[PDB]
Amino acid sequence: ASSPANKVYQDRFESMYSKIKDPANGYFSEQGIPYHSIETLMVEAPDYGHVTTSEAMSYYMWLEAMHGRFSGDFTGFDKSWSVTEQYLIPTEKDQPNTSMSRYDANKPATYAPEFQDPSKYPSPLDTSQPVGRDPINSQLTSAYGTSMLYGMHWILDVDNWYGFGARADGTSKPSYINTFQRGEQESTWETIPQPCWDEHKFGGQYGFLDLFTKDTGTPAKQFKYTNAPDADARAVQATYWADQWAKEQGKSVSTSVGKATKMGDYLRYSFFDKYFRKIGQPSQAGTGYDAAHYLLSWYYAWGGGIDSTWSWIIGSSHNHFGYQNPFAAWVLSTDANFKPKSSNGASDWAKSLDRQLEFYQWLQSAEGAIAGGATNSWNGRYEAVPSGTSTFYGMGYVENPVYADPGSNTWFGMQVWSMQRVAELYYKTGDARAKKLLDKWAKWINGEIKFNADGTFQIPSTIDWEGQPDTWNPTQGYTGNANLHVKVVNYGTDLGCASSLANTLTYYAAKSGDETSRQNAQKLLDAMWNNYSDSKGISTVEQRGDYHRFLDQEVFVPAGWTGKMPNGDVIKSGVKFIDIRSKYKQDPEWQTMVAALQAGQVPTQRLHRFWAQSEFAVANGVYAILFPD
């Protein structure tokens, strides 16, 4: 039998759950897939509101798990996994085993440099540059009997708004697409949306392939998918809780546990350097596990031929603290119900758990906030790490890993999303490393929360950094990083971040007994419920400072390259963001947004992001369970 939960906050979860699942609110497509946001005029990570991400799917799982805890019904949770497997994990038709089975573990892929400006692409493939060996592929094929990978592709065109369709048919939905391809300076506004399955039917002469990679001969028809490790790790985290809550009620989600465990087994590909180069000695090809940094890197990707048999797989050299998940690592390495079928699955995750906690501590600033991360590929070309640059196991410190437009660690959100997982670990195991991290971080954040007399509040929004951490010495440990400082540039009322913060403070308070954290967590939840509730969940008016880029952001296209988007939009040098997305002009909010820009004003919006609504719902549920009285 489940333990008693705080009635007030449980009702708040149930109310939010009803608003999110309400057919009249439009959070989901006809196929049952959650959108990034209800509103369509939306540009953040995705460049259209009805395009979805693996992040959203993992939040959908978390939401349904919590619903199972209070209702006793877990069919909704099992359904979230069914939708995930059907639409976000490439099927046998999307990643033909005929090509995947030709994968060569001794030559995983062909090296191509990364550049600091989109105008430097396409990047030339170089078969003469070293590439290490993949030590886990044999483990996976042996355990699962297939060469296909079981992981979520990160972004999906849910209602086929771009027109690529499924496997080049241009009419089916949902449609697998990808955007980011050209380095740290390619913002969401500077991409050229492309299909994952490229048969050269759309775009240019050879599809969109020669916009990104330059090969010796003619570009072959091929497919390619890209994973978002933090999303897959959250799916494991959510499934663990679903399993625990189901068992407390004599229920079972066995089938879903198996899927999560398999996903976690494949997620290990994010532990490796992009081209399997040795960690700390980037110029040398790895011989196996010496190319594993054991952290959840920015991605792992794979692809292969469509009309010819061949395939490749790559990990990632760039690591961001915001993507780590010590809780998922603990689950996969210690819980017997979640033990990966592969020979080294559980043991690799054990090593990752320890490495991840070292990573967090190394990045903890003098104040308490966690800094960016590190990379094993300086400038994305394995260049020499400048002297004086601090390192972590040979990897150079990087203030804003992977992206600089805007800086990947200038958003407060990464702080709460990641520390929330550390709080769950600390609550479950009382781990000393986790406690030390949280004690300092919590003291920092509790001093940055501002409550107004009218019931509204503010928390850090944009942050900046100065200095770097001291080089990591595993035997020395935390030095305090007196020369690493965080600075809060401005405050805001981001309801998604506030909910994640409340969640984090609740788990921490529950275990540590810190009253300051508990009352702040409750005050945030109450303030949002009482002052920001609407018929669709919660929301507030926010300024969209980058929306001017809709009209004035030029998109780079190589000289002489021309093509067309499915709707006829011409792609050629000189086009702006809007020129290759002309359907945006038919959006109900278009005229309003354009009017604002024409008057020299910053557009404003009231947005209902799926992850934010779910985050708030879950935070209420977590408080109800940990503080029943």
Active site residues: 55, 230
User: Closest Cα to residue 295, out of 327, 273, 275?
Assistant: 273
Q: Which two tokens stand for residue 173?
A: 């939905």
133 or 153, CB closer to Mg ion?
153
Measured from the CB atom, the residue of 414 and 510 that comes closer to Mg ion is 414
When CB distances are held under 5 to 8 angstroms depending on the partner's kind, the choice from Mg ion, Ca ion, none that residue 292 binds is none
* Residue 185 interacting entry, from Ca ion, Mg ion, none, C-beta within 5 to 8 Å by type: Ca ion
Separation of alpha carbons 319 and 285, rounded Å = 19
Give the torsion sign (CA, 400, 402, 404, 406): negative
Q: How far is CA 594 from the centre of its chain?
A: 30
439 binds, among Mg ion, Ca ion, none (CB under 5 to 8 A by kind): none
Q: Which residue, 35 or 300, is less far from Mg ion as judged by CB?
A: 300
Interface with Ca ion (CB under 5 A): 185, 187, 405
Please check whether residue 271 is in contact with residue 295, taking contact to mean a CB–CB distance below 8 angstroms.
Answer: yes
- We find the least distance from the C-beta atom of residue 300 to Mg ion, in angstroms, to be 10
Quote the CA–CA distance of 52 and 45 in Å, as a whole number.
10
Q: Which is nearer to Ca ion, 266 or 403 (CB)?
A: 403
Say if strands 533-534 and 537-538 run parallel, antiparallel, or are unpaired: antiparallel
Q: How far is the CB of 137 from Mg ion (least distance, A)?
A: 21
Q: 596-602: long-range contacts at Cβ-Cβ below 8 A with a sequence spacing of 24 or more? A: 597/547, 597/548, 597/550, 597/551, 602/543, 602/544, 602/545, 602/547
The partner in contact with residue 330, picked from Ca ion, Mg ion, none with C-beta cut-offs of 5 to 8 angstroms by kind, is none
Which does residue 405 bind out of Mg ion, Ca ion, none, counting CB within 5 to 8 angstroms by kind?
Answer: Ca ion
The DSSP-derived string for 295-317 is S-BS--EEEEESSS--EEEE--S
Q: Which stretch binds Mg ion (CB under 5 A): 291-299, 366-374, 443-451, 500-508?
A: 291-299
Token pair, residue 22, equals 């309400």
The smaller minimum CB distance to Mg ion, of residues 147 and 179, is found at: 179
Q: Which does 299 bind (CB under 5 to 8 A by kind): Mg ion, Ca ion, none?
A: Mg ion
Phi, psi at residue 460, to the nearest 5°?
Answer: -55, 145
580, two tokens: 């290759």
**Beta carbon of residue 189, minimum distance to Ca ion (angstroms, whole number):** 8
Q: Which residue is nearest to Mg ion (CB)?
A: 228
Instruction: Label residue 203 exposed, middle or buried (CB < 10 Å: 0-12, 13-18, 19+).
Output: buried
Which part of the chain contacts Mg ion (CB under 5 A), choosing from 141-149, 295-303, 329-337, 466-474? 295-303
Q: Is the dihedral of CA 337, 341, 344, 348 positive or negative?
A: negative
d(CA 107, CA 127): 10
DSSP state for residue 194 in the 8-state scheme: E
Residue 573 Cβ vs Ca ion, minimum distance, rounded to whole Å: 16
* Binders in 298-357 for Mg ion, by CB under 5 A: 298-299
CB of 228 to Mg ion, least distance (A): 4
In the bound state with Ca ion, the residue whose beta carbon lies nearer, of 405 and 542, is 405
Of the pair 405, 579, the CB lying nearest Ca ion is at: 405
Number of residues that bind Mg ion (CB under 5 A): 3
* Cα separation, 462 vs 488, whole angstroms: 6
Q: Which does 317 bind (CB under 5 to 8 A by kind): Mg ion, Ca ion, none?
A: none
Residue with the two structure tokens 């490229």: 198
Closest contact distance (angstroms) between CB of 230 and Mg ion is 7
If one asks whether residue 528 binds Mg ion (CB under 5 A), the answer comes out as no
User: What span, in angstroms and rounded, lies between the C-alpha atoms of 63 and 48?
Assistant: 23
Which strand (E) or helix (H) includes residue 353? helix 345-362
- Contacts of Mg ion in 204-233 (CB under 5 A): 228
Residue 151 Cβ vs Mg ion, minimum distance, rounded to whole Å: 12
List of residues 6+ apart from 381 with CB closer than 8 A: 113, 114
Q: What mask, x for binding Mg ion by CB under 5 A, covers residues 228 to 267?
A: x---------------------------------------
Residues interacting with Mg ion, by CB under 5 A?
228, 298-299
